[model samples]
Target: REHWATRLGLILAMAGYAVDLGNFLRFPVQAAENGGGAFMIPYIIAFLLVGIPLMWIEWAMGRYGGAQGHGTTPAIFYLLWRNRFAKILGVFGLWIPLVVASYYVYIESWTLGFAIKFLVGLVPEPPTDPDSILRPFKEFLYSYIGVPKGDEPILKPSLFAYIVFLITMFINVSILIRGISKGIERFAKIAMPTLFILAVFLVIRVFLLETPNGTAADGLNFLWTPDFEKLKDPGVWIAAVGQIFFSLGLGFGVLITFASYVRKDQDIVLSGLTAATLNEKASVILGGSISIPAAVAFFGVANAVAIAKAGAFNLGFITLPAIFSQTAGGTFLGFLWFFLLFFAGLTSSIAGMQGMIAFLEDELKLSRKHAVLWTAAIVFFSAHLVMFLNKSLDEMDFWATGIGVVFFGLTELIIFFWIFGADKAWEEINRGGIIKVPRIYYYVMRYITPAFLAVLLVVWAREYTHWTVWITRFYIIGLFLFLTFLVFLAERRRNHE
Candidate 1:
């Protein structure tokens, strides 16, 4: 069996996958968006109900499948349900990140390109004047990402973006070639340590920083100060739930893939909690500590909220850099910040790729080399649509990452807790375990997880249902069909070799 080199390696890799650039930018924004400190109420309740439960479930499921020599979700589902259609439906688990990683690479590469440029002084500096400070950040971000420049149509392909995209692909390919232990494990060991170091340094640096007005207290205070009134808002609760779901990369086929590489005797209980704790630390302690406080210190509360409210990608790309530019030693800080973020992106991209590769390896009987090449080809060719077509990433991400991911999670929750029976699933989870996973989670897994997910789906649909563009419809249909077809194709080829 292919096993992780060490328990520590598995833990680090899982943590690396869970903690990504999104947690760095998105979670802080979510806290600010949903009512500052008050968001933590739902976030913690949902974490107990949703995050930690799913974390344990995914790990247990993956390890169970791996023991039976099944690395892909289809084979895993077949073992659990004994129904062919169950296996077929399991394709969505793999399908989710396959589609996500395609365009995700493009987004991931931005940090790499931005980091290198910042280190080398290629990126333009933010203006020193406080009034027009964001001007340089606006120009650099819009121009670099090929979005739009000063009311112009999105015409030019960003040469810089493409260059970094290729480099990012190359890096993924190289790490993948080494297989799990040498490739993913070693990289995780090194990257996770360095990632934490950078995060801690930045958090401390940002904590001590004062704006030109010579005040830094508001930054910290604004982040933690509770907006008790917003607690009554359902939108705030849903946002908190959404943040928990997105923050840990739950329902994304990532944790399952990584966990499948573990040994049978491994402690899923402890390791699962450890990974969850590390990811939350990175988000609340590190992410909140850095971005919100810094933005508050520099831009103040109102402006910082506006910048963060702009969009998920905009805050990281546009707002943070602008904040960094105003601080002393801004250039060096930018290099450290962007490099940390790029590594987070790199680790996640690799984890997502491994899910697809594992499908080819386990189900198609392909060698690791062959699987890596095939996975790379699919992502490389598919990602071009984002560059060529209008709104490709936004459309596909909605179906694949947002709706599709939760759908995948919901399906598996039913299969594991309902079809397989909570009693049996609990037995499987406890097999060869070190610490006992308290008796409470057995009921939590069967009942609370599903209820939370169903409510989340309803709330999510309410918020994100309208679409007017032809491209949006095309992407939604085409990508789902493509993934479904891939599953059909794999089944047809299952008897080969």
Candidate 2:
């Protein structure tokens, strides 16, 4: 098995991988869109109930599967349940990352454009009039992403963004081709520390901003002061749980893939807890401190809340650019913000690429170089198609993030806790452990986590039932079938070999 070089490497990789666009864009919006300070109640509840359990289980599954020379979902499922149906079900673990990855890399590339723009002093100086500042970002987006507001014709992908996308993909594929310890783990050593430093520095800058219409205290009050009424809102609970899935990279193949390369006897207990906690700190604490309060201080509470409600993507793309333009040392801060975002996004893309690469190597018996090339080639072309078609990209992201991730988390929990036996899985978790896991979590793993997932899944189905477009459903189905066919071929070849 290809093992991580050190325990710290694994933890840093996991933590940094978790700090993706979701940490920056999604979490702040989720908090604002929910019940403000009241949101933390459900957030805490979800983290303890859903996040930690699934995190530990994913790590356990990956390490266990790795020991058996398996990294992808199908073989890992085969190991856990010893059933053909289980192997087929495990296909989503691969499908989710690979499909989502195709579009996600495009979003990640946005940071490169923003970062370079800021570094080159092309972001434009901040205007005193608030409305005037948005024009530059609007024009930038129109050019970069080809989305013209209202009825205007969609333009072709800008040269700037396309170039940035290639640069981004090249860096990801290069790091990935080197393999785990030398490639991913080595990068993580540098990436994680840099991300933390930037996060702290940005947060400090935010707190120092002059409060006019709103203050840091107001932001904290809105973000943390619990209103028990929000607890009654099932949507708040659902949002909290969804954030858990998004922030911790649960349901995504990332954590599982990372753990697949973990060294034997590397105490997953402490490692899981540490990684998840650090990730939460970065996401909730630093994520909140950097964006939400800063917005409140500068844009005022109403406008800040309005921006968040508009969409998560808009928060980073539209609002933050304006915010950065206004700040002292704005260009430098913008560079740090977007560059940090690039690092986070790159780590995540690498994680996604690693999952697909591992699948090729493990299932098809391809050499690492061949696997990297195939995965990189496919993802690059796929992203181009998604990049140009705005509606298709949005539809794909809906399924990839919403349905794709949740299903895998749900399937793994049931298989591990019920089919494999919770007691046995618990024992496996404790094996070679540095920290003692409380035995009470046995019941939580067996009952609570699965129940939580079941409810979340049901709620999503109910909400998206009439709202989700047919094209989105078809895209998801087509993606699943395509992936399943690939898995089928791989299995046939394995049997023949």
Q: Which residue pairs in candidate 2 have backbone atoms (N, alpha carbon, C) closer than 3 angstroms, thus clashing? A: 37-222, 37-223, 37-224
lDDT of each: 0.81, 0.81
Instruction: Give candidate 2 misplaced runs (Cα > 4 Å).
Output: 126-128, 149-155, 211-214, 465-478
Task: Tell how far residue 18 is off in model 2, in angstroms.
Answer: 0.9
Question: Candidate 2: lDDT of 209?
Answer: 78
* TM-score against native, each model: 0.94, 0.94
* Tens-digit lDDT string for candidate 1 (1-497): 57799888988998888889877788888887777888899999989988888878888889988887777677788778999888777877877887887788888888898899888888766444554777688788767767644453333558878888899999999999899999999999999999999999998888798765434567767767889899999888877877788888888877878888888777888888888898998888888888767777777666766756776576678777887776688899999989999999888899999988888887777899999999999889888766655566777788886788787888878887789888888887777777888898878888888888898788777876434346555654675677678777777886563
User: What shift in Å separates residue 109 of candidate 1 from its native position after superposition?
Assistant: 0.6
Tell how far residue 103 is off in model 2, in angstroms.
Answer: 1.3
Q: Listing every candidate in turn, what is its Cα RMSD in Å to the true structure after a full C-alpha superposition?
A: 2.3, 2.3
